[PDB]
Every structure is written in C-alpha cells, then in structure tokens.
C-alpha cells in the first residue's frame, strides 16, 4: 500500500494566491501579466516569463497589508515542476479574449475545437473533453531571483547562486537551480510530441493522449462510448495535423576549468531546452542556465535492469549569456590618437619591441577587400622568428582580441566524422572552420604534418576546406586569415644559412604568403635591460608599465572593417602606374642581387602589395589609396624582405 504523510504547503491556498498575483500585480496598460496575456491572445507573443523578482515584490507588498502569502518564491524553488502546471492552469482561467483582428487562416486547432464542440452539443441536449495542454499556445518559464543584497538571501534563493555541475548534488532534484558552465554539444531541433490526436476510422470520435515519458504506446482501440456500445472495435490513426508538438533541443553543459578541484575531471549535465528557448544555446557559449533539475527515468526494460540509479537533466527555463555612438567614439579616437602607431602598441603592450611586426598584424586584422575574381581579401603573414622570442605571446594576443579568432598548434585542423557512436552525427568541424570570419593562429607551424600541410594549402588558395570520407565530397567554408609562427629547426636561427633552409617549409607554401617577417632575438646591452624591467614590472603590479597610449577595446577595428568593407576603396590609375614601375624595378633589383633566391618578386607580391594598400586605406576612411598609401605599403614590403637579410 501507499502510506500518507503530512506536508505544510497547502496547494489550494497557493493556487488562490497565484491567481491573485496574476490578477492584482502592477509593477512600478493595467497589470503587467494581464497585459502579457493580452499580447498572447493576440498571437504576438508565446512566452510567459514569470519573473521571481515580481513575485518577491508582490509578497513584500502584501506583507505590510495582511501577509496574504505563503512564501511562493520559497515554495516554487523547492518544487517547480508542479508550479509550472499551477501557473498554466491559472493563466487558462484568466485568459483574456483577443483584442485584435488576428488572421485565422491556419486555425486547425480552432477548427477541431468548434467541430468537436458541435458534435458534442448536438447530443448533449439529448434531443474535460480537451486536454488542458492541447489548447495552450504559450510556453511558461521562470526567471530566477536577481541579487537581493538583503537579509532575505540568508543562504536562501538557491536560484540566485550560480552553481557548478559538481555542486549539483542529488538532493537538489526538483528544485529550480541555476548552473554556470560552457556548452559543448547542442543537438538539432526535434519535434517532441506532447499530446497525440488519434482519429478512429469509424465512430467519428477522436481521442487524445497526453504523454511525457520519452516513449509511449499508441492506443489503437476505439474506446469511445459509441464505438464501445456498438462494439465496432475500431482502430485509431494518428493525425499530426491535430496533434500538438513542441520543439525540443538537448544541449549539454560542461564546467569551466576554474571550477574543477585539483586532480579531478570536468563533469557534464544534460540540458533539455524546449519551447521558445530553442536555438538560444550554441557550443561556443558560457552561460548561466536556470532550470528545474529533474530525474529523467530509464522507463522500459533497462529500468528493471539498472534499478534506483536515476539519470538527471536540467529543464532549462532562462538562459543568461556571459561571453552609431561607437562610430562617433572611434571617429573621435581617430582625431585624438594616431591609430597607426597606437593600435600597434595596443596589440601587445606587454611585449617589448617588434613594432613593425605589430603594424603588419594590424593589416592582417583589417585586411583588404578584393572579393571580385578574374581575387582574395585575406592577408597571411608568417613569423619565422627564433626560439625564445615571444611569437606565441603575439599569437595569443591576436587570438584574444580578434573576433572569431582561434589558436592552435601543429602537433597535438582538418576534420573528423561521426565522433559519437549513438547519435551518429555528420560532418564535425575542426580548427580552421571555427575561425571562418577570423584568424587562425597556427603556432609551431613547422612541426605540422603533411595532411595538415595539404589542408592548409587548400584553405589558403581556396578559402574552403573539403573532405572525401565516403565519396560525399562535402566541403566546409573556412575563409580564415592565416597567422603562422614557425620557428627554426636545430634551435636558434642561423642568419648565415638561407632562410628556407633554416625552416622546413617548402618554398611553394612560403612564397604564397602575402608578407613574411624574420624576427629573431640578438643579445644586446640595452634592449634586454628594458625587456627585463618591463617583465619584472608586470610581475609586481599585475599590470603593464603604462608609458604611452594603450587602447584596449577591439570594436574600433570592427567598425573600420565594417565601414570600409562597403566602401571598397577604389584604386587610382596613378596608383596602378606607380605600382607597375614598382614591380619593374623590384624585379630588376631582384635579378641584380642574384643573394638568397627567396625574394624574386612574383605576381603574388603584387597581389599582396595591392591588398596591403587596400587594408591601409580601409583603416583610413575610404578611397585613401594614393601615392601616400602605396609608399607605406611598399616600404613595409621592402622592410619585411630586408628582415630576411637582417645582419
């Protein structure tokens, strides 16, 4: 038998209080929630976000005038699933009639309403039928309590404290909690059925079946009164037209590396977003998901197979992300600060020296626009450098400021197919596709195998990576700007040896790079002293030794690229002339020098010069490409070439 227990909650009084709250609450138009229900009746909104701050304010207001409440906020944070049904029932009771001419072109549910009502009425006079969830066209959610900063939050308001996946103990099941973590795997949207709309071949009667079990059994038996009394034994046919579906997405939230105790492994927690919250979560997110932590049961046969050990999921209710005024601000900064010399030092404030490398990194960050083909607007630079030089620090600084920027190493791109056996997903990405409209910081570029060599070669002159797993020949758009940080083999760079001999990169791949910098360290007497002072100051004060203008926000570069991308600075005819004689004399001096053959100016150097000039004008208003721009571009190109011949 089932015993009985005494619990002081009194659901009926709570329901009366709930109805009073939905009727008699007006935030400091009429009532807020009545206005929301009016909008719902107009079919202009299908999300009743029941805030808990509002319920707390309602309780506080009625505390001074009768205390006509039973701590609802503390009564639904303990059991939220039942109160979702209570709120839905209270909304159906107080649902206002529409106050708008809503088109009813697709009124299948209304058609079923009136049809079944007429069929019942023609015999009711003898001359609930509809499930409560079937009629609802809204989804109800809970917004957790905000910060209290008062004695009310005396360790209470468990939905106020963002927990981690490890701290979600088993005794929180059924409560309305919130977790903080990084999404890792969000599934595709699937229509989860809430109530089926079986129709019988005879007897005319359709019987509905509410289901929340992840698995059900079709009725297929006309148990209707007419069918049973006539013993027709009719079978039932599903009608997806008259059924009710809710979009279902099954996310999965991990925990941040700062929440994991030492020696442990990050945990994970399944999230079941459904309703209007679908597609609000993506794998590259850090969120504070608020939901009801519920024990999904192993209903079926593995049920008896396992036992009391349940599996849990978080029925998400509210997702809070963490991650022309700006145009005026950046315009004013342009007027005040010299972008050319300021943004360069802003990229790597904690990295001393190598200013021209930073200037080239600005051009890569902006990049010219030459989408028209006959070509490409992606700037690629490689820093051959030297062991012990802060190439990796520069790469990380670029990654942390460049939108859609990723950092990766040669030895641990490409792509993998169908990683999980169960779901059997198709065409999982890699590292180059993630930085589609961004930059890939390929550290240890020399130590990167032939497969990735071919992959990056395809990406570099195709902007689209492809696979040939099972003859599908599918491709992934990866228009990523490439930033390489290869380092010389046999340790330190040898200036005497030829540059391509020092690093195991084929001349075919290196020659396609728009600009190349060889930036090696030399033991000096003053540069090292300033470097040591800088690093030690950073260690003391945890902040850079600020000695000049150091802008921080990257939105200025975003504004510049978005501004001049539509502008597309058109090159001048005199510019084209000066660059054709520039190529002529460059090739002439390349011959007369031939010392290292890693120079012969090539059509690709002209394309790189054009795109660098385009990027420079793209930074400075529109159509600024003139002699002034091309002189700086050619100066940068010549300096980069000379860098290969340093000392």
């Amino acid at each position: 038998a089932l015993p009985s227990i005494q619990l002081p909650v009194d659901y009926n009084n709570l329901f009366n209080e709930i109805t009073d709250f939905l009727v008699t609450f007006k935030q400091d138009k009429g009532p807020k929630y009545m206005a929301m229900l009016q909008k719902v009746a107009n079919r202009e909104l299908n999300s009743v976000i029941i805030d808990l701050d509002d319920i707390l304010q309602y309780q506080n207001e009625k505390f001074l005038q009768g205390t006509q409440a039973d701590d609802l906020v503390s009564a639904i944070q303990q059991n939220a699933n039942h109160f979702t049904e209570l709120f839905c029932r209270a909304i159906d009771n107080n649902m206002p009639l529409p106050t708008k001419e809503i088109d009813y072109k697709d009124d299948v549910l209304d058609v079923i309403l009136n049809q079944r009502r007429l069929r019942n009425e023609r015999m009711l006079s003898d001359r609930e039928l509809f499930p409560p969830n079937l009629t609802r066209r809204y989804f109800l959610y809970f917004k957790p309590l905000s910060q209290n900063c008062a004695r009310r939050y005396r360790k209470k308001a468990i939905s106020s404290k963002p927990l981690s996946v490890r701290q979600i103990k088993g005794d929180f099941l059924g409560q309305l909690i919130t977790v903080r973590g990084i999404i890792t795997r969000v599934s595709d949207v699937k229509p989860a059925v809430e109530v089926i709309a079986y129709t019988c071949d005879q007897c005319g009667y359709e019987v509905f079946q509410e289901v929340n079990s992840r698995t059900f059994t079709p009725l297929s038996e006309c148990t209707s009164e007419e069918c049973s009394q006539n013993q027709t034994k009719g079978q039932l046919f599903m009608s997806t037209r008259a059924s009710k579906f809710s979009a279902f997405q099954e996310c999965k939230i991990q925990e941040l590396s700062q929440q994991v105790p030492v020696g442990h492994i990050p945990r994970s927690l399944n999230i079941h977003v459904n309703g209007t919250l679908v597609r609000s979560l993506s794998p590259g997110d850090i969120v504070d998901v608020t939901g009801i932590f519920l024990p999904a049961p192993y209903t079926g046969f593995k049920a008896l197979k396992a036992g009391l050990l349940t599996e849990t999921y978080l029925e998400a209710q509210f997702v809070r992300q963490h991650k022309s005024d700006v145009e005026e601000r950046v315009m004013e900064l342009i007027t005040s600060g010299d972008v050319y010399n300021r943004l360069a030092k802003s990229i790597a404030p904690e990295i001393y020296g190598n200013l021209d490398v930073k200037k080239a990194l600005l051009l890569l960050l902006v990049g010219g626009v030459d989408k028209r083909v006959g070509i490409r607007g992606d700037i690629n630079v490689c820093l051959m450098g030297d062991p012990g030089v802060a190439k990796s620090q520069l790469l990380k600084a670029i990654c942390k400021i460049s939108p859609r920027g990723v950092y990766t190493t040669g030895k641990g791109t490409a792509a993998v197919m169908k990683d999980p056996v169960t779901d059997e997903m198709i065409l999982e990405g890699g590292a180059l596709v993630l930085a589609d409209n961004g930059i890939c910081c390929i550290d240890e570029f020399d130590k990167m195998d032939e497969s990735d060599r071919t992959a990056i070669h395809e990406v570099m002159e195709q902007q689209t990576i492809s696979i040939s797993k099972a003859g599908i020949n599918t491709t992934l758009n990866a228009r990523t700007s490439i930033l390489a940080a290869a380092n010389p083999l046999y340790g330190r760079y040898n200036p005497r040896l030829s540059p391509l001999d020092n690093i195991n990169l084929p001349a075919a791949l290196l020659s396609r790079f728009d600009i190349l910098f060889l930036m090696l360290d030399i033991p000096s007497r003053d540069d090292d002293e300033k470097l040591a002072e800088h690093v030690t100051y950073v260690h003391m004060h945890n902040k850079q030794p600020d000695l000049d203008f150091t802008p921080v926000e990257p939105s200025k570069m975003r504004e510049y690229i978005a501004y001049a991308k539509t502008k597309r600075p058109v090159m001048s005819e005199a510019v084209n002339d000066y660059v054709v004689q520039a190529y002529i004399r460059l090739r002439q001096d390349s011959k007369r020098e031939m010392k290292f053959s890693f120079g012969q100016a090539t059509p690709r150097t002209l394309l790189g010069i054009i795109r660098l000039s385009q990027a420079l004008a793209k930074l400075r208003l529109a159509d600024m490409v003139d002699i002034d721009d091309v002189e700086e571009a050619l100066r940068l190109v010549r300096v980069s070439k000379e860098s290969l011949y340093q000392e």
Binding site: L2, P3, S4, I5, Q6, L7, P8, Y11, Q78, N79, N81, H82, R154, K155, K161, K169, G170, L173, G174, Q175, T184, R185, Q254, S257, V262, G263, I265, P266, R267, L294, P295, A303, L304, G307, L308, L309, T310, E350, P387, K396, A397, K400, T409, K411, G412, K447, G491, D521, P523, S524, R525, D528, E529, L531, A532, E533, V535, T536, H539, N542
Partner: protein, 645 residues
C-alpha cells in the same frame, strides 16, 4: 523486534554516557541552523558522527563485538538511536516544507582500533564477509556520482493528501529486504491519479570507487588486487584516483551466484563489495598520516624559529637526501622546486606558471634516479613515470567506459593526477616522439586538451616536472656542445627551468669520499633489528584507524615535509624592486656575455630567475622577495648554466 529496541536503548545509553557525541551533534545542528539563518554560502555540515570503537568497547563490550562482527544487526539500531537523539535535542525550528518529507537519518562513522579487521584488499578473504572491516590501499577508479532514489513523495490532486513510498536496494541498506522495481505509483489505492513531487522526494548521491592494495605491499610475483567500495551521500567525491585511502565499511556480498537454474555446474561466485562508512585519507607515503599533515602550534613555533637561521636554505637542502653524497646544488634546486614560485593568473587570459621544472642529464650511476625516488618519497603528491613505460594517452587522459553507469568517460593520466604536484619522469630521453608532444604541451601551457571520442575538455595539469635523462652516447662528452649530447629537441629543453649536467669524473680524493659514504650507508642497521637479520617488512603500523636560535645540522624528513607544507600554504611572496635590480642585472650579464654564447639564454631565463627567487623567499618564510633571494637564485642559475661554482 524486541532485540532491535534493546539495541536502540543500549546505544542511547551509550550516547548519554559519553557526552562528547551529544556535544558534536549539538555543534552540527547549531552550525546548520546558523548557516540557514545567514549569501554565497554552501558549507552545510553532514549528518554524520564519528564514534570511537574504543569507547564503545569500554562501555559495552557485547555491543562493540556485535558492531565489529555482525554490523548488519547492530549498526541500523545504533543509527536509529543517533537519529532519535538528534531529533529529541533538536532546536525544533519552523519546517521548510521539505525536511519534513525528505529523510535525513543520522549516519554513523567509526574510528579507533580494529585488530584483526585492519585488512588490505589482498587479505580480504570470504571469512570477513558481513563483518565491519577497514581496508587500506590506493584508489584507482571512481565512478560518476549518480543520484539514486530512496523515497518518492506523491501528491494526489483529489484528496489533498501526500503519499510517499520508500525504496531499498542491495547497496543502500545493510539488512536484506525485498527489492523495489523503482517504478513510481501512478495510481492510488482508491483509483486516484498521482503526480510525483520532485523536491519533496529523497535522492542520495551514489559513487563506486575501486581500492587496490599498495603496489609495494604485494607479495613477490603477484600483481595488486582490488576491491570495490560503494560510497554514498556525504562520502561521495571524498576520494580521487591516486589517493592513498583507508576505507572502513561492511564487507557485503550480493547476488544468487548461479543457484538460479541458468547455472547448475557453472562455478562463478558472488559479487562482493564494501559499503563504505568512513574514508580516512592517509597519504604522503608515511603510512598513517594525511598528505596535509596536521601542524601543531609547537611545530609552527619551531618552523618559525628555524626560518630565522642565517643558513636555513643550506640546512634544508643538505637535509633532503642525506644518503646521496654531493649534488648540493641539485638538492638546493629540488628544494626550491618543492615550494614552487607564486603563480600569476593575469588578466586577458595570461597565466604565468609558478612551478619549477628541473632536468638532470649526466653519466650513468650519478644518483640521477635516486634523487627522483627521493622526490617521490618526499613530495606531498608525486607520480612516478618512466620513458619506456608510458604513452601519451597514459600521461594525459584515457577515454574509457564507465561500468557503474555505462557511458564514455575520461580517466586522468599519470600527469593530470599529479595536478599541483610533481612528476618524476625517469629515463626521459627514451620517450617516443609521439608520446613526447603531450608533456611538451603540459610544460608549455599546463593544461591537456582532449579531442577524441566526441569529447572536448581541457583538463588541468599544473604539475612541476623533474626528469632524469641520459646523454645521446653512453656518457657525457665534454668535447661536444650541450645540444648533440642530449637527444631532446631544444623546443622541449627550453621548458626546463634548470638543466643540470652531471659528470662522473674519475678523481682520487672524491672517489675515496664517495666510497666511504656509500659504505657507511650500506652498514646502516634499523633500530629494531639484529645484525645479519633480513629486513622483513610488515607495515602493520595500523594500531588505530582514524586520527587516533636552534641550529640543527640535519632536520628530519617528516619535519622537512611539515616545513614544506607550511611554507606552501602560508606565505605568498611578493616581488620587490630591490630584488628586481639584482634580477635584471644578472639577466643582462648572463644574456650578453661571451662565455654564455654556447648557452641557450633567452627571455625564459628571466622568468626562471623570478620563480627561483620567489621559491627562495618561500624558504625564508618572508612575505616579500629581497636582495639575498635574487642573489641566490642568480647564483643557482649561473651554476646550472656555467657550473664554475
């Protein structure tokens, strides 16, 4: 159930006699009440009382023997007595509408002396079944914490009444009862529909760790044996793999083991496992004390007194490995590595590691591996690794499948388990190149990344690696640069703070000194042993389970470990300008010097200088770095690079 009531009242009398347990229950209750009345707080004390078995034996020997011999009949009554005691003396506050329904029985934990029950997973035979035993060993696997149902509370929306239902399993309750199919009752007795009330039900966490005997305890010629403990509630997540542990619990069996028609001659046995009641974390290889050794006020006073010595660094260093003659600078570097520099979690994602890495490359038989073994035996958390016997998967993470839950899971490798510890990689150069990229990544950014089997995580490996390597040839060749002597890439040698080169130069005075020292070492006789008697080991030091100016030349190893723990926990040195002057002067001198042309000096040596100076500041217990700290760090680094003195 007259016997049940008799046991309950006898244990109530015992609890009344020894008022310390009542005081502990009162303390737990007031702590919970104050936390409930007082915010970003989650520290709630569990409903668990640790009773000493010695007190129970002295009070009622019959009850004590019943607990130790047939706990399935004596522990439930004692737990019920404890629950009744806590309820009677409870402050009877206002209900929270959940504690009334959610059961919170007061569990019991035991300590004290066990005698014949102080066992190990190898010596845990079938004659110990259904008895309360304590097993000591190393945790190797830990299942995922998965909540399990023990009571479901239902609300019938037709009578306004609440109906519950208790659930029992073989792994939850000691006494055997009819298992429940774990299906919620969807209909009442009187044809009423019921809705399950989550949040008024009761779920308890459930974990299944695996404890195996210590590898050094295994008999000659056999691999360690393991047992499976089933921790639940407050004892979940108390242990992680690699932890030396001492689990107290009831050695239970389950199943029909054949005897089910399906098996007539089949000769399989029953599934046996321990229902853990207590987890006591003995650690640090000292066989009886925790890794975080308790610090008495006398010990802290003595530590502070010794920190004032002018040559505390020399005393601590020379006291590290007294059996290893010479290698004073390597000992100093090892001690500095034991208390690593402060770790800087800068903004914009920057992260400056505070762990010191030491590489020792040199001629054979120069105590390169005995120093590693000593670091293993001394550091609070050290993991032994060898070049040949370790793969990248075995060093970072292995994608295995959980057996308790049946799903894919990551298992921490040998160099994630050593998080916040040290890794002693012996025979470093023998590692295969495919298995060397992993340690390169870890020493680079101190986190491993996993991208296999549809798993994308980033485990934390903040370990300081000390490695011993051999030259490319048999012995170090002074006629070649220190690049072709070592078979490792410079991109990997750059991650080692100190690269000590040891040479077995053949002298005559030094050879005499070393021979005399080694012969003195080989004549050592243990205190409780006769001459010419083999040194048998029993390690049966488990007499009890649970917690039951000055200028010395050499400090004892346990005191050295206490000092290291105190220095790591307490003092967090901060850099100072007076030390930075020395640091920058020495770095500039080292960089642009003719003799240092062969040296690989880069900007990393500056960070090494800062880390060594901060470590030496930790040695002095000074909360700030001084000129002497930077001077000593510079001298040590100069010896590591040049080696003149």
């Amino acid at each position: 159930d007259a016997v049940f009531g008799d046991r309950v009242r006898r244990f109530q009398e015992f609890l009344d006699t020894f008022t310390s347990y009542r005081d502990s229950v009162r303390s737990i209750q007031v702590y919970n009440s104050n936390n409930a009345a007082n915010s970003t707080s989650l520290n709630i004390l569990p409903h668990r009382i640790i009773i000493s078995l010695d007190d129970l034996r002295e009070f009622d020997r019959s009850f004590w023997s019943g607990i130790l011999v047939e706990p399935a009949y004596f522990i439930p009554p004692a737990e019920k007595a404890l629950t009744d005691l806590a309820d009677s003396m409870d402050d009877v506050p206002h209900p929270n509408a959940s504690a009334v329904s959610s059961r919170h029985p007061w569990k019991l934990s035991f300590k004290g002396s066990f005698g014949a029950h102080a066992l190990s997973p190898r010596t845990l035979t079938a004659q110990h079944l259904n008895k309360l035993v304590s097993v000591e060993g190393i945790v190797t696997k830990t299942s995922l914490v998965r909540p399990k149902l023990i009571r479901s509370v239902h609300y019938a929306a037709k009578t306004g009444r609440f109906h519950y239902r208790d659930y029992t399993d073989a792994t939850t309750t000691l006494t055997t009862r009819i298992p429940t199919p774990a299906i919620y009752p969807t209909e009442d007795t009187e044809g009423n529909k019921l809705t399950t009330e989550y949040g008024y039900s009761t779920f308890i966490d459930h974990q299944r760790i695996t404890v195996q005997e210590m590898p050094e305890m295994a008999p000659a010629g056999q691999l360690p044996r393991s047992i499976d403990v089933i921790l639940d509630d407050d004892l979940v997540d108390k242990t992680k793999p690699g932890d030396r542990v001492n689990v107290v619990g009831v050695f239970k069996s389950l199943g029909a083991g054949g005897m089910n028609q399906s098996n007539s001659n089949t000769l399989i046995g029953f599934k046996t496992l321990i229902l853990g009641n207590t987890v006591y974390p003995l650690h640090a290889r000292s066989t009886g004390v925790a890794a975080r050794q308790m610090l008495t006020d006398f010990d802290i006073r003595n530590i502070n007194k010794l920190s004032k010595k002018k040559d505390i660094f020399d005393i601590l260093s020379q006291s590290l490995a007294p059996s290893i003659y010479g290698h004073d600078h390597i000992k100093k570097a090892i001690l500095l590595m034991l208390m690593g520099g402060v770790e800087k979690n800068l903004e914009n994602g920057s992260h400056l590691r505070g762990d010191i890495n030491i590489l020792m490359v040199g001629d054979p038989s120069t105590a390169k591996s005995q120093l590693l073994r000593f670091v293993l035996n001394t550091a609070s958390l050290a993991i032994a690794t060898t070049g040949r016997g370790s793969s990248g998967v075995g060093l970072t993470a292995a994608v295995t499948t959980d057996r308790e839950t049946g799903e894919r899971r990551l298992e921490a490798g040998a160099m994630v388990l050593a998080d916040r510890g040290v890794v002693c990689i012996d025979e470093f150069d023998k590692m295969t190149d495919v298995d060397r990229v992993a340690i390169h990544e870890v020493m680079e950014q101190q986190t491993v990344t996993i991208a296999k089997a549809g798993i994308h995580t980033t485990l934390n490996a903040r370990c300081s690696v000390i490695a011993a390597a051999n030259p490319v040839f048999g012995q170090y060749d002074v006629n070649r640069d220190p690049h072709q002597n070592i078979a490792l890439p410079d991109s990997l040698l750059s991650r080692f703070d100190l690269l000590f080169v040891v040479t077995d130069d053949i002298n005559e005075i030094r050879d005499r000194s070393i021979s005399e020292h080694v012969l003195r070492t080989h004549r050592y006789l243990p205190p409780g042993y006769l001459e010419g008697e083999p040194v048998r080991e029993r390690l049966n030091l488990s007499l009890a389970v649970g917690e039951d100016t000055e200028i010395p030349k050499l400090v004892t190893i346990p005191f050295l470990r206490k000092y290291v723990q105190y220095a790591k926990e307490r003092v967090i040195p901060q850099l100072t300008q007076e030390a930075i002057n020395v640091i920058v002067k020495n770095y500039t001198d080292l960089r642009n010097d003719d003799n240092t042309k062969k040296s690989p000096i880069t900007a990393r040596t500056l960070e090494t200088l800062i880390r060594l100076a901060t470590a030496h500041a930790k040695v002095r217990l000074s909360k700030t770095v001084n000129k002497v700290d930077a001077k000593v760090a510079a001298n040590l680094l100069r010896f590591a690079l040049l080696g003149e003195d």
